Amino acid sequence: QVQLVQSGAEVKKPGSSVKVACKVSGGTFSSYTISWVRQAPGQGLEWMGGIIPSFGVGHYSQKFRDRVTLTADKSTTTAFLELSSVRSEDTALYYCAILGTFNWKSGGNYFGPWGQGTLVTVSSASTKGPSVFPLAPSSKSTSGGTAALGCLVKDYFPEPVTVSWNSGALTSGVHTFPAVLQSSGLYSLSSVVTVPSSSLGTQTYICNVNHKPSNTKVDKKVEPK
């Protein structure tokens, strides 16, 4: 099966140009249409346009035609979405996808994989890495055989941070909350996990925080208070 892998999250200042990359596995663009879909908060999914790299043709929706350009690097089978004159309103998750249309020449590839999404944040605020603080378990965070512990990921910009526990070994009981924008302009979130209260003296618990826009990696042991 073909897989699409997009470039990482990105913050760009207003008025700048933005490029999102979409690497198509399989070594060929074949007859695919590479489409781009925007998911902005509160506006669902909107098709921006698509490129048929084998024919060097692209088409767009009226909403984006005058400020979007599609390209393809055939030496790397990578398609690129280029946004011009970015505005705050362009802060969105951008997906690439193999999605063609009947009226254009699909090659039969109306359905294909989707990429994982690229969060583009349009802001004048500068990139800032997280502070990671423990949420220590205690008598106030146990309920019988269940104890809760966590990590407070604070003062970062932009989104997103990723949080794993024990380097991905702990998944059951994990809740990572949506980030909230603080009065400061920076984001804060917490990640919590409920574990057996009997394991608290035996098992070590590490939250692994990744903030790629600042290339900050923090592993914090969470100990009982």
Binding site: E46, T101, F102, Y110, S141, F177, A179, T194
Partner: protein, 217 residues
């Protein structure tokens, strides 16, 4: 452009119930030669790209459970989920690939209605590392509750707080259909050390009465 109008915008249905989602196109998406409808249904779960469920109005993709069924033709389409299960929580989108521009419906949010579950309330004092800087965050966690509606109020030495806390709520859990909620009270270290009792008061349909969790600094 072909405009897709989806119905409903939001849906809450119990486990084992049938969910019905509808889409109306402003123009037919039917190709007269083969009588194929160029219409698809997608499912988007939290944190993931949309996943194709149904192509050609009624063709189920591999790996999609048989509970998922698509129907209709021309301008009117329906997605039927039989015997809803916890992992069906998602936003569902219709899509037309007949004519450019490709268009999507606006999305239907599907919530699972389960039995009322009271939150387990947990509280966390600020870390001393955080206190080594000039700030102190106090976190109240409401874990694994249903329904989503809950009220969290902060009291510091019995004085109600306003404007210095923020809430975040998870998406509905795909296994137990519960929510979790964090309320964070943020104070300067200076203000945190002036007071002794930090209390989170939680009111929720599943609680015998307003429960309050606190700690003494």
């Amino acid at each position: 452009d072909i405009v897709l109008t989806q119905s409903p915008d939001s849906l809450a249905a119990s486990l084992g119930e049938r969910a019905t989602i509808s889409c109306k196109s402003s123009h037919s998406v039917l190709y007269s030669s083969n009588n194929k409808d160029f219409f698809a249904w997608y499912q988007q779960k939290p944190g993931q790209p949309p996943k194709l469920l149904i192509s050609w109005a009624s063709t189920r993709e591999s790996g999609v459970p048989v509970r998922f069924n698509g129907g209709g033709s021309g301008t009117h389409f329906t997605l039927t989920i039989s015997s809803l299960q916890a992992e069906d929580v998602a936003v569902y989108y219709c899509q037309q690939y007949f004519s450019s521009p490709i268009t999507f419906g606006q999305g239907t949010r599907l919530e699972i209605k389960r039995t009322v579950a009271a939150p387990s309330v947990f509280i966390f004092p600020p870390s001393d590392e955080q206190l080594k800087s000039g700030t102190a965050s106090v976190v109240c966690l409401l874990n694994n509750f249903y329904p989503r509606e809950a009220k969290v109020q902060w009291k510091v030495d019995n004085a109600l707080q306003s404007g210095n806390s923020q809430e975040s709520v998870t998406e509905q859990d795909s296994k137990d259909s519960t929510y979790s909620l964090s309320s964070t009270l943020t104070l300067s270290k200076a203000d945190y050390e002036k007071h002794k009792v930090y209390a989170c008061e939680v009111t929720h349909q599943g609680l015998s009465s307003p429960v309050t969790k606190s700690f003494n600094r």
